[PDB]
Structures are given as structure tokens and as C-alpha cells.
Write a protein that binds this ligand. Structure first.
Ligand code: A1B4C
Ligand code: ZN
Length: 139
């Protein structure tokens, strides 16, 4: 679990969005595993606007942060799960690191701010849904 709180927006994994997220929907994209809902309170976070390919992510299954080198946002094949059929997920960045399903939502940050959230994993890999291209989150 986990979310990004920026301005009057909450960014979560689309597959973990609650009834309240869907009732306050601003934007969602199944191909990116992202959903953004509106909030009444001002958020605590800042979004990176950069091309960093190194950062640190929070791994809830280890209660620890890990440093990672990650690929540029791309279209990556993701096998079927209980939440989605087998498909290509876009804007996804992979890195070598530990993850378990419950780790989705953990934030990846660089020196400039929030880069994305944990969205996929398996066999020593971890995938992050990028949010750096969503410029409207800042306005
Ligand atoms: C951190 S998630 C993970 N980690 C390790 C093993 C397995 C997983 N799960 C995983 O990749 N899923 C399940 C949840 C929806 C994901 C998606 N974005 O399509 C795909
Ligand atoms: Zn950066």
C-alpha cells in the first residue's frame, strides 16, 4: 500500500484504489496501473521533473529503503494477475530489488522529489509506475 499526496490530489495504484478514490476520480489509466483522486486537504509531497535513473524506494515487506538504478519509462509485458489480464503496462521502469505484492504504493524518490510508485515485481526485480510526465499534478 501507499499513495502520493500532491496539492489536492492523491495518486495510488489503480488496482488498490478504494471506493472513495473512485467516487472522487480525477484520472485513471489501466495501462499504467495509476489512479488519481481529489482530496480536501493539501498534500505533503513534491513531484520530480527530471531524467534521473537512480533513486531510493521504500520496501514495506522489509521495512527498509533501498537504492536502485532503474530503466527509462517503457512498455513492458506484465503477466496476468487477479487484477489484470496479461498485457503491456506503459510508463513502467524496472530495477533490480526485492518486492512482494503488498509492496505496491511504496514511493521511489530521487534528489528532486517523487519519481513514481512500486507497481510490479518478481524474481529480484521491482517495477515503478512513473509520474514525472503528469505535469498537471503541480497545478
Ligand atoms: C510489487 S508487485 C509484485 N512483486 C513481487 C511479485 C509479484 C508482484 N505482483 C505484481 O507484479 N502484480 C500484481 C499486482 C498488479 C501488478 C500490475 N501492475 O499489473 C502486477
Ligand atoms: Zn531527479
Amino acid at each position: 500500500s501507499g499513495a502520493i499526496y500532491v496539492g489536492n490530489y492523491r495518486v495510488v495504484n489503480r488496482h488498490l484504489a478504494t471506493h472513495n478514490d473512485w467516487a472522487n476520480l480525477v484520472w485513471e489509466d489501466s495501462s499504467r496501473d495509476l489512479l488519481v483522486s481529489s482530496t480536501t486537504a493539501q498534500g505533503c509531497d513534491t513531484i520530480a521533473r527530471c531524467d534521473c535513473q537512480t533513486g531510493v524506494y521504500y520496501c514495506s515487506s522489509r521495512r527498509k529503503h533501498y537504492p536502485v538504478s532503474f530503466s527509462k519509462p517503457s512498455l513492458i509485458f506484465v503477466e496476468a494477475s487477479e487484477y489484470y489480464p496479461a498485457r503491456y503496462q506503459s510508463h513502467l521502469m524496472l530495477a533490480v530489488g526485492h518486492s512482494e505484492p503488498g509492496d505496491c504504493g511504496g514511493i521511489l524518490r530521487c534528489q528532486h522529489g517523487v519519481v513514481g510508485i512500486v507497481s510490479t515485481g518478481g524474481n529480484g526485480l521491482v517495477g515503478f509506475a512513473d509520474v514525472r510526465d503528469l505535469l498537471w499534478l503541480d497545478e
